[PDB]
Amino acid sequence: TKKHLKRLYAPKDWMLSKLTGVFAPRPRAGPHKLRECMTLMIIIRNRLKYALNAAEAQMILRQGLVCVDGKPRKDTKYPVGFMDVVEIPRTGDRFRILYDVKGRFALVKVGEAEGNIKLLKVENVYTSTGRIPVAMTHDGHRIRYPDPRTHRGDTLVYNLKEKKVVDLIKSSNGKVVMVTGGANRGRIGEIMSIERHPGAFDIARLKDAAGHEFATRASNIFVIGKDMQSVPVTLPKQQGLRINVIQEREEKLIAAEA
Amino acid sequence: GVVHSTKMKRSIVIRRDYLHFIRKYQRYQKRHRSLTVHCSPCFDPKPGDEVIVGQCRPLSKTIRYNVLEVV
Amino acid sequence: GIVRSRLHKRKITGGKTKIHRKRMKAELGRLPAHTKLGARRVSPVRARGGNFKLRGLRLDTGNFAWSTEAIAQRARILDVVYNATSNELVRTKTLVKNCIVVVDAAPFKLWYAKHDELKRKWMLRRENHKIEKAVADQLKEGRLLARITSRPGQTARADGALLEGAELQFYLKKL
RNA sequence: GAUCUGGUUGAUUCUGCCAGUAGUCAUAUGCUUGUUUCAAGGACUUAGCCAUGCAUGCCUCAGAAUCACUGCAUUGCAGGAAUCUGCGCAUGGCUCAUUACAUCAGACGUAAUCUGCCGCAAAAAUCUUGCGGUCUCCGCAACAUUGGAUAACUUGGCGAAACGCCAAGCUAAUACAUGAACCAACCGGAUGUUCUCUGUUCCGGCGGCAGGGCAACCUGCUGCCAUGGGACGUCCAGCGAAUGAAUGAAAGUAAAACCAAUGCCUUCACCGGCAGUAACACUCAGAAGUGUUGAUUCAAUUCAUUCCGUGCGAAAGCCGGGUUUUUUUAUCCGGCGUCUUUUGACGAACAACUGCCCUAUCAGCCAGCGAUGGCCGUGUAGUGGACUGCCAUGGCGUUGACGGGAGCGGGGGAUUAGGGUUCGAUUCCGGAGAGGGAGCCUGAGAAAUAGCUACCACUUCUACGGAGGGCAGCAGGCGCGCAAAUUGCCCAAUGU
RNA sequence: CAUCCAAAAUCGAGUAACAAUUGGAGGACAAGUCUGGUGCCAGCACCCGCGGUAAUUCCAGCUCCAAAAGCGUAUAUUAAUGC
RNA sequence: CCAGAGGGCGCCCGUGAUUUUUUACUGUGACUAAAAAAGUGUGACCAAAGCAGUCAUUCGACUUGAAUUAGAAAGCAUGGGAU
Structure with a gap:
């Protein structure tokens, strides 16, 4: 059990300094891992600059003003990985995080249509009670799964307000x-x-x-x-x-x- | 590896041989290890035969491999 | 402090290792459960997930199954006869997995009756079937040889199976 | 910047050491000092001993308020102490004593396993309540007007002291203990001496009776059944767990007749042939003929037996907002919280392919007391001589075993043309430890020491009847040594 | 630390006393055939060596040289070492 | 919704070597946390450092920047055919 992360044990992709405290936030268990992700307070403060320091951050977050995947997130720390969508109403900005050349996280800006669209890989496919097929990805389960059943390593298209699944790709x-x-x-x-x-x-x-x-x-x-x-x-x-x-x-x- | 001794009941003994390199001298050197593996009664390989084996969960105190295929 | 490790043991080379550490709760034995014949007693403990298990003591009642008829029904363990681990366990009337014991026989005898409209079924089921002569003599007499296939120190129940031709002759010839 | 010099003779040429010379976050010790930026600092010897003070707690719109408490209002509203409840203190800090198939680094594995908080996703079990009567059991209704305790507080107190304690009287819950019909589905089993389509159906069976009846059987008499399906009734069915069966695709010859069925053509015909043809007794004419992996005794499915506290509530919960017109609706909408199941990553535990100082004035080391392997068990979260019983005689080593000496491992530092030599207690990563040893509780996780129990060493207070202590946390002492800082200020920054 | 000594309006170097040191001068190794004191004593010297009345080395003056807000001394270790 | 007939490709399985062959070596790729080291850019007043920051007379533009490399032995893929 470890509850503390430090600045020299944290990734380079967050771009924190050696100096200026010896501690970094440890994101919780969540939709993504610890060795790739970008935590909430790191995004807000160090990138978009609507917070200058720690107190500022939570004084935004805790009021439910920041929403990844259409669900408002109170927590100070909480990871946000590849292929998610962050929508903060108050500004009129929207982000879809992604990777970019030189291996480093990037931020796109998207409009209406694609603020409800996402993609999900398939890690495994397994069977549950009543002979109900199941899939598993990075973010979450979700159930059955036609669009037409098939197989691992393939990629879906997922809609977030309700499921309308466009097709999938293999x-x-x-x-x-x-x-x-x-x-x-x-x-x-x-x-x-x-x-x-x-x-x-x-x-x-x-x-x-x-x-x-x-x-x-x-x-x-x-x-x-x-x-x-x-x-x-x-x-x-x-x-x-x-x-x-x-x-x-x-x-x-x-x-x-x- | 190859076979060294057929003793015991279903438990054969493997020898291996391989080289090693010391950067300062720039020359090679010989070394052996040995392992204590399981042999199914399906096979009965003789000393000096080659073999190919596989990783397994502990089946005895020393024994961590099991035979697949003989040559 | 009962431990499960290779630390206290010797090397393969006949040498002796030196410690630098105490002992953990990760390694952990607990003293054997000895499960006899008598009214049900249970002695629940807790494991490392927060999941109880049930150390059984004294079990007189059982559940036993035919193979080949694909049923199971109850019965009462009467006497212990053969055990291959020790003769110690026999004499004390303790119960371990793959122990050979004796059962009431009654529910099996009962059920094999049934192997109105029913009157047709008792032909159709009895057709394409025979029962072993080995099994027969036993079943009649009112006692059978059965084998417990459950581990009755970590579930606090005994369950078993029942012995047809091959297995059965290998046991009888000991006795 | 791939370099040298002085010293053996009366003088000379060599070999070879001694001495000179330059760095070192590498420490000490003298002399000496004007500004500024930056920074290590009781590790070496003693992991030896410690006075005093501090070093881990937490409340929102949203779990429990009759402070004999405060403000405002005058029967209400807002604050609301320390107490019950839920969560956390197993992390962070500090130190290197033990320690060489040990630790550790690189690369792999768990189909041998556990896993609270967090993410995402599920859930169709259960005869309960009120009314009326009473015979115990009924009739009549439907939004569950559940139940019993205990702190703070008061009353008596006890004790020299003590993070010591007792009797009595009060009252709470998201504490603890109960318990929910119809509403509410799909699918399958086992069956009735139930009745009605019916046997078209006899040779045998099941019998039911009398004569001889010893009920062996012979005889005569008699009913039903010998392909079946429709209705009605009864018992069982959920999740998770145990045991035994079954399923968990196949992929190596080609055309006719035989009877038992049975389908379709077809005919007045249950006449005699194969053109058509996923499956299949209606109601459902496609409402799974098809799980993942290199590999499964796995996932999941079906059937039979079982589950008793050691599992499963809609918290019998809390808060808002719009309504409504009476403030004050079964009026609608929203935010929280929690039990059970499933699988991801935050973790934990276990296993080992390859590698690393010195020593042979350490050459044989391993089985009574497990040493190597085998068989059935036991134990554990699980694998295993981890352990019991029984049976074999193996295992390792001059390509340095076993034993001893030095030593926490690695990332790395110093020096350097190059090859190398040397150091790494110490910021990051892994391990171990908390005076020395052992044992244990709680918990998802600890063999936890600012947790508990005992012994040994040391030590404090005492009214001698007893009760205690653990700085290798931060400051500060004592001792030691050649040698190492303030008994400060602050949560503003960086985190938990 | 940085800025400024009035924007109408605010100080201050001359022996620049507001005054650098620590080890050296025979050789190795940059730098005195100077002047007093001592006379195998006292001491110096990592090494070779100096001192017995003209001591280039000791104890002090004066002058000169190396590094400089730093400079010696011990111990360990690396380079010098193809010892 | 141009049919019959052999061809050809992509998946899957089964059967066949008189004995099928392999490594060291070397080429190119896979995999592998920072700090430190190496290195690109930038007038923190130079510098030792640090990842910053520079323009624009405006309610922001750089679609700002923070490159790149190294890391014994061993492991993994795919080429080479001399020793």
């Missing part, structure tokens, strides 16, 4: 993917060949726009859509392309003139 060649984990995340690609190694980690081989193809595992893959015109959701300014270190550097120089 893991098959020529489709499109965004990545998590593995120091390869914040990219986007196609799906070429998937190697299967029994009893052992399963290795995928991918591609992306204008070549520079690559590879990862298969539990770091999260499907997005059939094609890159077929996407249900919006994406950052970068389209999941890494470009070379030298290219980047050079460009930053040339444009700095102002």
Whole structure:
């Protein structure tokens, strides 16, 4: 049992300093893990800057003014992972968090339609009392599951005010993917060949726009859509392309003139 | 690994051999380990035969593997 | 302080290990339950999940099952006869899993009657069936040899099965 | 910045040590000092001994208010102490004494397991209450007017002291103990000497009677059944748990006749042939013929037996808001809270593929008292010589066992052309410990010491009858040593 | 710490007494063939060595050299070490 | 809703080697917390540091920035065919 987290045992992706206290908030058990997530008070304070310090944060949160997934959240700390939607009425802002190139969390801004749309992977599929089929994901169960039954590793489309499930998408060649984990995340690609190694980690081989193809595992893959015109959701300014270190550097120089 | 001794009842004894590297000298060195594994009465492999085995939950004090396949 | 570890034991090399630690509640034995014949007594304890278990003491009553007829019905354990762990356990009339004991027989005898409109069923069921001669002699006489297949120190009940040809001859020849 | 110099002779060329020289968050010790930024600091010897003070508590619109308590109002409203209740104190801090298939790091596993708070998702069991009569048991209704206790407080007190204690009298609940019909479904079992479609149906069976009846059987008489389905009645059925059966797809030849059925054509026909053809006795003409994994004695399903406190309430709960017109509705709407089941991640426990100082003036080490393995058990959350009984004779080692010495492990630091040598008590990560040993309670989690019990060592108060203590938490002492700070200020920041 | 000594309106260096030290000067190793005192004594010296009346080394003056708000001394360890 | 007939591909299973073959090595990828180290950018008045911050005469714009690498042995995938 551990109730304390510290600044040097916390991820780099939150971008907290070495200095300025020796403690960081430990998010609770929730829809997502401790080693990837962004906790509430970290978002509000250190990003959107509607809080300057700890007291400020809870003086927002505890009044029910912040809502991930349509449910108001009183708690100071509570994790928010990949592919969630944060809606704070008072401003008129809406976020859909995501990863972006350089492996680091990013924030999109979305309108009406996509403030009710989400996506969910499938981790496992199992059977419960009365022969009722069940799925399990990151965030939550939810029950049965047609849209038409099928299989693990596939990706659904979930609506949050009520279920209207548009279809789903599967893991098959020529489709499109965004990545998590593995120091390869914040990219986007196609799906070429998937190697299967029994009893052992399963290795995928991918591609992306204008070549520079690559590879990862298969539990770091999260499907997005059939094609890159077929996407249900919006994406950052970068389209999941890494470009070379030298290219980047050079460009930053040339444009700095102002 | 290979086989070293057929003794006991259903419990055979494996030897392994493999190398090691010391960075300073830049030369290699030989070492062995040994393991005490389970052998089904289905097989009856002889000393010096190769074998392939598998991981398992503890079946005895030392014994943590069980034979799959003989060569 | 009863412990379950390899710490107090020797190495494979005949050496002896040195500790640097006390002992935990993670490792934990508790003293054996010895479950005899007599009126039901129970001695509930608590485990490491907050889940009780029921240490049984003295069980005279049972539940026993045919294979092949796919039923189970009650009965009363009468005497203990054979145990293969020790002859100690026999003489004390204690009960452990895979112990061989004796039962009332009555509910089985009863039920096998039934193996109006009913009058047709008693033909159809009795067709395509025989009962062992091994089993027969016993069942008639009013006592049977049965085997408890439950662990009756950690559930506080005895349940069992019943012995047909193969198993049965292996036991009888001991006696 | 891949470098050198002085000293053996009367003088010379070598070999080889001694001495010089530069760093070191690497410590001490003298001399010396004007500004400013930054920062380690009783670890080395003693994990030795400690005076005093502080170091963990928590209330909102939302669990219990008759302070003999306060304000305002004059029979109400708002504050409301310390008490019951719920949650937490197993985290954080501090210290390296023990400790080499030990710990630990990299990479893996749990299909061998437990898991409070948190996320998401479920839930169709139960003869209860009021009225009237009474025969114990009924008739008549329907939104459950449940039950018994205990603190604070008062009354007597006891004691030298004590985070010591007693008798009596009062009253609460989201404490504790009970208990909910119809409303309210789908699906399956076992059955009646129930009656009615019926046997179209005999050869056998079940019998039912008399004569001989020893009820062996022979004879005569007689009823029903020998493919079936419709209605009516009775007992059982939920979640979770135990035991025994069954299910948990298949994937290696090709055309006719035989009888038992039985379907469809077809005919006046229950006449004699195969064109059509998911399944199947109506009501439901598709209301699962199809779980995941590399792998399952797993998930889940069906049937038979069972469950007794050691499991299962709609808290018999709380608060708002709109209404309504009487403030004051079974009027609607919302926010909280909790029992049970299921599985994620916050964790815990267990297992080991590879690797690491010195020593042979340590060469044999392991079974009476488990050493290696086997079989049935026992125990535990679970796997296992973890342990009992019984049976075998194995296991390890000169590619350094066993024993001893030094030592908490790692990320890393110093020095450096390169190869290396050396250090790591100490900010982060893992482990262990709280004077020395052991044992235990509570709890989801502890062998917890600002928890308990006992002994040993040390020690305090006493009216001698007894009652206590544990700084390797922060300050501050004492002792020790070559050597290390204030008996400050504050929750503003960073967290719990 | 930073800013300022009036925006109408607010101080102050001359021996700049508001005054740097700690180890050295035969060799190794940058720097005195200077002047007194001592006379194998007292002491210095990591090493080689100096001192017996002209002591380049001791004890002190004066001058000079190295580093500088720092500079010596011991102990341990690394480099120097292809010891 | 162009039929019959062999072809060809993608999943799944079963049967077949006279003995099927493998590692060290090396190329390219998988996997792997910070602090520290290496390194890109930036006039904290330089600096040791730190991840900041710079413009705009306006109720904000940079769709701000916080790159990138290293990490013995062992483990994992896929190429090479010399020793």
